[PDB]
Amino acid sequence: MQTYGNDTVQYEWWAGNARFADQSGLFIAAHVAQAALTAFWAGAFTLFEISRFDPTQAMGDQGLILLPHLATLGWGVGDGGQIVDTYPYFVIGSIHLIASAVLGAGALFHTLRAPADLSTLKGQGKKFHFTWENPQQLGIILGHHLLFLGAGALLLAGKAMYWGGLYDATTQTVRLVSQPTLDPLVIYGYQTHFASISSLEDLVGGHIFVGFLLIGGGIWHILVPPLGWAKKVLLFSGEAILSYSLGGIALAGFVAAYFCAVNTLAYPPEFYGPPLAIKLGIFPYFADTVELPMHAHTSRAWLANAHFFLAFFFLQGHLWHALRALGFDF
Amino acid sequence: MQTYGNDTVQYEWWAGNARFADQSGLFIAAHVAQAALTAFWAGAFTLFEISRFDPTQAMGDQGLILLPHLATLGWGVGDGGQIVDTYPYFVIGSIHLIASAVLGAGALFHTLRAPADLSTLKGQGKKFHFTWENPQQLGIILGHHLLFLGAGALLLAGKAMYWGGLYDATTQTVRLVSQPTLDPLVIYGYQTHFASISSLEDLVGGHIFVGFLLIGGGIWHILVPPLGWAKKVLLFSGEAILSYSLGGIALAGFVAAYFCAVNTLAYPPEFYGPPLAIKLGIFPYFADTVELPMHAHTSRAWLANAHFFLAFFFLQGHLWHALRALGFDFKRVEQAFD
Amino acid sequence: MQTYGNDTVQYEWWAGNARFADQSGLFIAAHVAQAALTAFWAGAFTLFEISRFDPTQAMGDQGLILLPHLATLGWGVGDGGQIVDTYPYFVIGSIHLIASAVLGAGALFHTLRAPADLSTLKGQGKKFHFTWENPQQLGIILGHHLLFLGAGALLLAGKAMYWGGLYDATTQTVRLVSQPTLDPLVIYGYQTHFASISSLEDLVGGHIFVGFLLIGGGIWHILVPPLGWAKKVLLFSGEAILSYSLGGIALAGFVAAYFCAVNTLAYPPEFYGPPLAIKLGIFPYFADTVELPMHAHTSRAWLANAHFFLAFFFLQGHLWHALRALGFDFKRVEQAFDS
Amino acid sequence: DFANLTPCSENPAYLAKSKNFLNTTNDPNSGKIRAERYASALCGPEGYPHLIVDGRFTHAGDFLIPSILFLYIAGWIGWVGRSYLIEIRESKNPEMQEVVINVPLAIKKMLGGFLWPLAAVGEYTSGKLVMKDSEIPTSPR
């Protein structure tokens, strides 16, 4: 991390996560504990919402945060209205609870067995050591992470047409998108009118072009080191690299907050909720057009308004890190 | 700036924008953030107007000023003038919001990451460094900006001739201007009745003649610097170059206020509102032809009366800065009354 | 400027305009700003009263003075003496107002950038440096100004004969005049009935005869210096030449106040109003014939009764400066009443 | 706008009372002349002229012309009283010239007071109108 005008800062108990920023072993252990808590949140709150799910009522009024996402992928949906099966939603949250214990096992593994710095040990273990000033291994980490997100977008391509189908909100009996709209001219013009989607062949075809770009750039960052022009304009520091991802996540969060309240095809109001509108003013928040029965907010309202505030606090959290990485103030 | 008598003068927080007049790196950072704030207004208020737009009423009375400019281009109507598609209004405000984030990036880049003075940089950063005493570098900046303004005027006439055409009010439909104006006798005669124009074909050939002129002046200012004709008659101070641009944009703002009051073709009446008689009272203004309910002034009257007051005060700011550049300290007036 | 022998007169703020009377560059700057303020009033108040103009009513009863001036020249008038075009009043009111901005810029140029004394300047400004005690330089200034006044009177004759047409108050239409008078006897006969001419073809021919006289007079003043008899009988001080100008323009004010009130040709009654009766009370004033109520004073009673007082108070201003030029200290009044 | 003030020509209370206006002088038509003069004013519900002093030049004769005419005369009385007091202060006996006024000196000052506003501006500029605070008798705080 960026030490403020010196070499080593002895951080206090309040800023306790600034202490291990130069430690490679504790960097792995803290980050896979975040993924353990993310897989626990994906797993335990899947089963939490099953226990509070009434299929007679509307699914949007019960605050389902993970069930309409699983209904969008098509794990056991019904064309006659309400979702029929429950065990596909049960096994997905049970798998994430298993993977949270596996990721939680790796949280304590690199905490205690591994040292704080991954250079004391050897034997194909010193290769998994990174330094914030060294560009070569950071391109290896970025190249390998983009290979999984390239495969993650390819896994949706495997799911849509080799391993199942995708729920289409118009036909209501999936679509099973086999050959999508693979047009480079369509996806280039879709930079602006992305608020509403009319066909999911653009979604499956968009994930083809995103995934091939991600696996194309993933294998590119593996082969070559970072260039000198990227070293010149971008600071290669601990807080600087954090500021680059915190800017992109907050950019992704603001898009995800806007895409929740305005989309009706990949976010169908059958089980997500009716769409919303942006209420500008002192607090820009998304307010429900639909009238909830007794002082409630729907799932689309809860997803959009939380992700707007979380990306805003990431935006202000990026300003605390980017001004510190440049050494401008505080 | 001016540096009255002695140099190394300091400015307080109410005049703190004058501290970076000699700093080239911070001069970029303030101006690009102005273009970031201008393109943010061009994008967010395109979204603010389309959220408040109702197609039942007329276009001008609702208080929307941005979308009539795009409808004049032919990007809001297909037939009738009712404005039936809001998709080309959405692509413009989203592009200007993207460009404002790009211009917001490089502006904060030049005030925190890049140095505040470009004279300490090496490579292309030394070639971009400028000071307010070198006319050769100021001719390089002016010649390259004049190329961009000439390309901007050519892209309007290029779109009007080959990429869709403009909205012609006398036929109420978009049309191609594939036969342009190439005889400069009619442009020279348009100095008098410039604001009473009723020809879309003569307007596009004007921008062809304008856009070919500002690239001619753009090329001329690059390969030839300012010389002894221009150095002896024009001051080259920090506020002197600002003063010429302040009155230069006030002259443009006075014409644009007058062109937004009596024209019917580049400001169609079903998009902006009816043309206005030129009134004058304590101050000049462009009053409405008819009194709309709850005194809602039309978008044509909101554009013309605001641009008149902006051009008057920019003429007054030109007078403040030209007096400050020449050497008047605004304190000799009180000392004569003694 | 009269200094009463003292070379170091400081002057207070109320007489602060006397400080630049010996400074040639600052003399230009105040006078050009006066012409900037004069052309601004010709421009802004043409546009002020074209907004206040009601075409159904007569413009005389509305209280407008600049639109009847342009309507008598023949702009915006149809076949019945009414007003149908608001555009030539707008163009002329714009042309005067833009030219006031050029003059307002050139006054600030001669205040700030140009030197206070033009003897310091090298080039053509050294030729423009005038001193008050140089009669040869002042006739060059006077002769060039007589050329533009002669060109202005020929332009009005040119506007009536060729470039448009004047208004005919007898036939209530805009008439292009053709072939005005050339005999000098009728203009010499117009010294008596100057205010009752009632003829366009003799008004233009009189303007031809004074346009050729002023241009020929400006030829004589540029080429020939003052001979010496005028130096003996007229003073050549700064306040002395101002005294002759204030006296000369007071007589022109008294004529124009009288010519506005009784003449119907150059001041038509459907543009201005009925010809005013020459009344007199504790002050002379030209009163309304028709006597429109609610303090109307229908726009010829404003022109005539302002150009008499402004001529009277320039006649008082001529007397203030001619007394100062001849050597009256004006503080000797106070020592006359002292014990 | 004065919507509660009708003009006295159209005020029915004034119109029924102006026919009974008394004569203030020996002229038998004094009440008739006052009836025509007060008709141009603004009247209330009781038919009496209510004057408007806000600064409108339509009602400039209500207060402004009284203001201009008063301040000229009251400035004249103050200026010739100040200038006589200054002139007798330089004499051998300034005390006796106040109870026994030098009347030819008083008439000389009083006829010269018609140019008091030009003399007041000039004396303010010369510094002889306003005394400095260091040169004035002062209370002991």
Ligand code: CLA
């Ligand atoms: C990608 C995310 C990211 C990462 C990895 C870090 C990492 C770092 N930041 Mg941080 N930062 C971010 C985002 C991030 N930040 C955001 C979101 C903010 C805005 C709030 C900031 C603003 C910030 C400040 C102000 C500080 C840092 C500092 C730190 C360092 C130590 C932090 C620590 O010990 O935590 C300890 C954490 C706590 C004690 C918890 C805070 C207490 C709050 C009130 C708990 C409740 C939070 C919230 C209300 C709960 C809502 C729940 C709801 C969502 C359901 C570390 C290098 C510190 C530093 O470098 O010192 C100069 C420092 O002082 N950052």
Ligand code: CLA
């Ligand atoms: C997502 C939540 C989370 C995660 C998983 C991490 C992860 C990490 N923290 Mg922690 N921390 C958190 C949030 C988190 N923190 C919050 C919000 C606070 C602010 C209240 C802190 C404040 C804090 C302190 C004060 C320090 C850590 C340290 C550690 C690292 C070493 C732990 C270790 O090896 O144990 C065994 C311990 C050691 C080998 C020696 C480390 C020194 C002490 C004993 C660590 C224990 C502090 C504290 C009790 C940890 C729990 C905090 C909180 C979850 C209750 C570990 C990787 C340490 C660090 O950065 O490593 C250098 C450090 O000193 N944390």
Ligand code: CLA
């Ligand atoms: C293109 C525009 C331009 C440029 C770049 C300059 C540049 C500058 N001028 Mg300025 N000037 C101009 C035009 C311009 N001026 C105009 C139009 C005016 C006439 C009003 C002036 C009058 C002027 C004065 C009087 C002074 C300068 C000063 C300054 C300097 C510091 C300004 C500062 O710190 O702001 C500080 C800004 C503020 C404190 C904010 C004030 C905001 C006010 C209230 C206006 C708000 C807008 C208003 C509500 C209308 C809204 C319009 C609506 C459509 C949105 C700087 C060199 C100073 C200088 O050169 O001497 C040191 C100085 O004293 N200028």
Ligand code: CLA
């Ligand atoms: C359109 C809006 C606009 C933009 C684009 C800028 C642009 C600029 N301003 Mg600014 N300014 C504006 C409006 C604007 N201002 C207004 C209206 C005010 C009146 C409140 C000022 C008053 C102001 C001051 C007082 C100063 C500037 C300076 C700066 C420059 C560098 C700031 C920096 O990095 O600090 C670097 C600063 C230092 C290393 C030391 C200076 C300490 C001052 C107090 C820092 C103030 C910076 C501040 C955040 C700028 C915005 C002010 C306000 C709008 C919040 C930057 C190019 C600074 C400058 O000229 O740089 C030398 C500066 O001193 N401006």
Ligand code: CLA
């Ligand atoms: C039609 C209106 C008019 C015009 C165009 C002028 C023009 C002139 N006057 Mg001026 N003035 C006027 C009205 C006018 N006056 C009236 C109404 C008053 C009485 C209040 C005065 C009292 C006055 C004073 C007290 C003095 C002038 C002087 C000057 C000159 C100042 C500029 C100069 O030479 O820069 C160079 C000037 C200087 C180096 C010193 C003067 C400093 C400032 C610029 C004086 C400006 C005072 C200003 C005009 C008062 C405004 C009055 C009114 C318009 C509101 C200029 C030639 C000055 C002069 O001749 O000095 C050489 C002088 O001292 N004026």
Ligand SMILES: CC1=C(/C=C/C(C)=C/C=C/C(C)=C/C=C/C=C(C)/C=C/C=C(C)/C=C/C2=C(C)CCCC2(C)C)C(C)(C)CCC1
């Ligand atoms: C020298 C001097 C002075 C003086 C000056 C003056 C007083 C002048 C003035 C000047 C001026 C006064 C100028 C002018 C200007 C003008 C203006 C500035 C205007 C504006 C406007 C415009 C330009 C336009 C208009 C229009 C038209 C024409 C058409 C229609 C539309 C519109 C309305 C837009 C003084 C004393 C201060 C001081 C000392 C020095």
